[PDB]
Amino acid sequence: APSILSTESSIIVIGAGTWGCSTALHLARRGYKDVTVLDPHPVPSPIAAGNDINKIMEHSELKDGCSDPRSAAFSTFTRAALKAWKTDPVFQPYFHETGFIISGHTPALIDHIRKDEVECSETNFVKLETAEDFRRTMPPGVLTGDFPGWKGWLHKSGAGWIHAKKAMISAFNEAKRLGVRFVTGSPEGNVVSLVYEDGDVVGARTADGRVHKAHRTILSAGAGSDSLLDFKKQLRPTAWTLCHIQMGPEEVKQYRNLPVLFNIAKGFFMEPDEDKHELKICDEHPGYCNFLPDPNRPGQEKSVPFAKHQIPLEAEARARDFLHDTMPHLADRPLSFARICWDADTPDRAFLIDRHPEHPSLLVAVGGSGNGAMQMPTIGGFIADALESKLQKEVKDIVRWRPETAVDRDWRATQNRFGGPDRIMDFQQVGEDQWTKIGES
Ligand SMILES: Cc1cc2nc3c(=O)[nH]c(=O)nc-3n(C[C@H](O)[C@H](O)[C@H](O)COP(=O)(O)OP(=O)(O)OC[C@H]3O[C@@H](n4cnc5c(N)ncnc54)[C@H](O)[C@@H]3O)c2cc1C
Numbered sequence: 001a002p003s004i005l006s007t008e009s010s011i012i013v014i015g016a017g018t019w020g021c022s023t024a025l026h027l028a029r030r031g032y033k034d035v036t037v038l039d040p041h042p043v044p045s046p047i048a049a050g051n052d053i054n055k056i057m058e059h060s061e062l063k064d065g066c067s068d069p070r071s072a073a074f075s076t077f078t079r080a081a082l083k084a085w086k087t088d089p090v091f092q093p094y095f096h097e098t099g100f101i102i103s104g105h106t107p108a109l110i111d112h113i114r115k116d117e118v119e120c121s122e123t124n125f126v127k128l129e130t131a132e133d134f135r136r137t138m139p140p141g142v143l144t145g146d147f148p149g150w151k152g153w154l155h156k157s158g159a160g161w162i163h164a165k166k167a168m169i170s171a172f173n174e175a176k177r178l179g180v181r182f183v184t185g186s187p188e189g190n191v192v193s194l195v196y197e198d199g200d201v202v203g204a205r206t207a208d209g210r211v212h213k214a215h216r217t218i219l220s221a222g223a224g225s226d227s228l229l230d231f232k233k234q235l236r237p238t239a240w241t242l243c244h245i246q247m248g249p250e251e252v253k254q255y256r257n258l259p260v261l262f263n264i265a266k267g268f269f270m271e272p273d274e275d276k277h278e279l280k281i282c283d284e285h286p287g288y289c290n291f292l293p294d295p296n297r298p299g300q301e302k303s304v305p306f307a308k309h310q311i312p313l314e315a316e317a318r319a320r321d322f323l324h325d326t327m328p329h330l331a332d333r334p335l336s337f338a339r340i341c342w343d344a345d346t347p348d349r350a351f352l353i354d355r356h357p358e359h360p361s362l363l364v365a366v367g368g369s370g371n372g373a374m375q376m377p378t379i380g381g382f383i384a385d386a387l388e389s390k391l392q393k394e395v396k397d398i399v400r401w402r403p404e405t406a407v408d409r410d411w412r413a414t415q416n417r418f419g420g421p422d423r424i425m426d427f428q429q430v431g432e433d434q435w436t437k438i439g440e441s
Contacts, residue, residue, distance in 0.1 A: 002200060002360040003215045005388065010034040012214040014191050014204055014228065015221030016043050016184055018050030018164070018373055019365050021171040022380030023220060025090065028178035030384060036181045036212065038204060040190035043172040043182070047307050049222055049343045050164045052242070054270040054280055055373035056260050057085060058100050058159040066120035070350050073398035077351070077375055077382070082158055084377035090174050091377040094167040098271075099259030100159035101137060103128065103152025105325070109265050109418065110151045118153050125153035134261075134326075141254045143261075145326040154259060161260055161270045164373045171376065183212075191221070194228060194362070201362040216387060220365040223305045223342035230296070232403035234352060235344040235367060236411055237303045238287035239427070241315035243338035243436070244278035245330055252277045265418040267322040278336055283318035285420030288340070289411060290427040301411060305342040306427075310435040318420055338436050345369045345415055347405045353386050354401040363387050364401070370417075 003009065011032060013020050016039035027035050044051040059078040062071055085095035102117060104110045118125055128134050131147040137154055176182060183189040187207035195203045195211055203213040219225050223237040247255065252272050262268040267283040289303035316335065323331035344367055346352050352367035365383045372379070385391045391399075412424045 005216065007031045007033060009215040010213070011036070011216045011218065012204055012212055013037040013218045013220060015039060015219070015225070016172065016182060017045055017048035017220070017222050018168060018368070018376050019220040019222070019379050019383065020218075021168050021175060022376050022378075023218060023365065023383045024175040024180045024380070025171045025178070026380035026384045028175050028180050033179065035179075036183060036214070037175075038189040038191050038206065038212065039182070039184040040186040040207075042184045044165055044168050045184075047222075047224070047305070047342065048168070049341050049368065050168050050373050050376065052164045052280075052341070052373070053244075053273040053278065054161045055164040056100065056159075056262070056268070056270075057081070057095060057162050057374040058155070060155075060158070061122040063120055063122060070348060070398050073350060073395040074371075076392075076394045077378070080378040080381070081375050085162065088377050090170050091167050094163040094170065096160045096162070096257070097157065098160040098257050099157070100155045101128065101134075101152050101259050101261045102155070103134075103150050103261070103263045104265060105147075105149040105263060106265075113153065113264065123155050123158070125155055128152040128154060137261075138258050139254045139256070141251070142258065143326055144329050145324065147325055150263065150325065152263075156259075159260070162374060162376070163273070164376065167376055191228060194219075196359070199359065201356070201359045216361050216363065218363045218365060218383065218387065220383070222366070222368065223344045225364070225366045226302075226344060227304070229356075229362075229364070231364075231366070233406035233409040234346055234401075234403055236289065236409070237305050237342055237344050238289055238424075239305065239340045239342045240282060240285075240287060240370075241311040241319075241338070241340055242280055242282045243311055243316060243319050243335045244276075244280050245333045246336040247272045247277040247279055249277070255279065261326065263322065263325075266325065267319060267419070269322070269326075279330070281319040281322060283315050283322060283420065284418065285315075285318065286414040286417040286422065286424050287345075288312075288425045288427050291411070292428070303411065307340075308435070309337070309339045310438060311338040311340060312430050313434050313436060314420075316436055335436060335438055338438055343368045343370055343372065347409060349415060351399045352401070353383055353391065353399045355386065355389075357401055
């Protein structure tokens with residue numbers, strides 16, 4: 001039914017974010033001559049979850065008795081990703097293999113980590129038992145806290161952090177040098193609808209009323225994808241929170257080459273960025289939704305993203321609680337920046353990358369599920385493979401279109417996340433005066 005795919009086939013990519021820029025770059029490398037990317041914002045988009053001074057990268061090989069099909073698929077994604085972060089000239093300068101510490105501060109959290117993470121991994125970890133053990137993982141003056149009740153595990157190699165924002169820009173620049181066209185801005189790149197003819201997708205319509213036609217359309221608009229196609233509940237747009245503290249010009253010099261410090265029920269931080277010397281803290285929790293009436297499902301809810309360069313005050317407080325335990329000397333410092341950041345969870349938090357069974361010219365590439373940024377170097381390769389009907393067997397069935405897994409989906413499932421109230425939160429229940437007020441009077 002669909003037109004025969006060739007390198008001369010016109011291709012539209014909706015969304016110039018983490019996955020879209022990667023897909024554009026891979027398509028261009030494969031020789032596709034007519035690729036156009038649409039985005040309501042210029043790269044890097046302010047609403048792209050990948051637009052972040054840092055994200056965590058981690059790869060684990062699993063012991064045999066822990067390798068179900070879904071986790072084997074994920075290891076396949078991250079194995080490929082890790083290799084590319086270390087080699088692809090477009091991405092290599094932005095990966096910092098500083099290691100990764102996973103930890104918890106109650107017996108139940110520690111046991112969950114030991115049983116379900118550490119003992120399933122082929123990684124050899126260093127066990128951190130005491131506050132002193134924690135502090136010694138970083139240079140003097142960095143970690144100063146008492147880590148009360150904390151125990152953890154340090155993974156030295158195959159993990160660290162990536163400069164997601166610069167790597168995205170790097171992928172964008174290279175896609176462009178290789179001939180990809182980017183229509184980025186509003187209304188010209190703001191897609192409001194897919195375009196249908198004969199029951200197939202033939203392109204995209206933007207908010208200026210222009211119709212963009214293509215032989216293939218790739219939907220990779222992150223959380224925003226959920227309003228451009230009926231995903232049959234397969235996506236839950238969900239938001240996490242970050243804030244930055246601005247480090248001083250002398251103090252920042254100790255904060256170099258730091259392993260990621262992650263408490264699965266409190267949060268994490270990464271080292272200050274090279275440009276602004278800002279230290280980022282994410283407070284860990286199951287996520288905020290923004291539950292509004294589903295326009296197509298009477299009596300049902302649907303989480304709808306919105307952009308804000310503030311975070312709820314309760315999130316800031318969780319971030320400072322994390323700081324009190326680890327770096328109390330910073331716990332009262334003013335925030336220089338904060339924002340909410342949107343991704344979308346599938347029901348099993350595996351990716352969703354597949355051609356649409358009812359519209360063969362449409363490829364969806366969505367469902368980052370909290371783990372999509374570290375995939376940036378290689379995800380466009382899997383996505384391109386899917387477009388070319390050769391997505392490899394280790395992953396293709398795990399990431400397929402699977403609406404049957406989302407029937408009567410419970411939006412308030414915590415989906416293996418912890419922290420804060422240990423429940424899914426709702427922005428509709430956050431008071432208008434209950435946000436940070438960075439940059440205001
Ligand atoms: C706080 C937070 C921390 C995270 N930490 C990590 C981590 O440490 N490691 C990790 O691997 N992952 C992490 N993630 C997840 C990761 O950021 C996402 O999975 C990944 O960036 C998603 O990539 P994406 O391309 O699907 O979406 P995005 O990067 O959000 O890009 C989507 C793009 O689509 C565009 N768009 C939107 N709407 C429309 C429209 N109508 N038309 C056209 N275009 C459009 C947007 O402007 C945007 O540029 C984190 C996520 C959050 C929220």
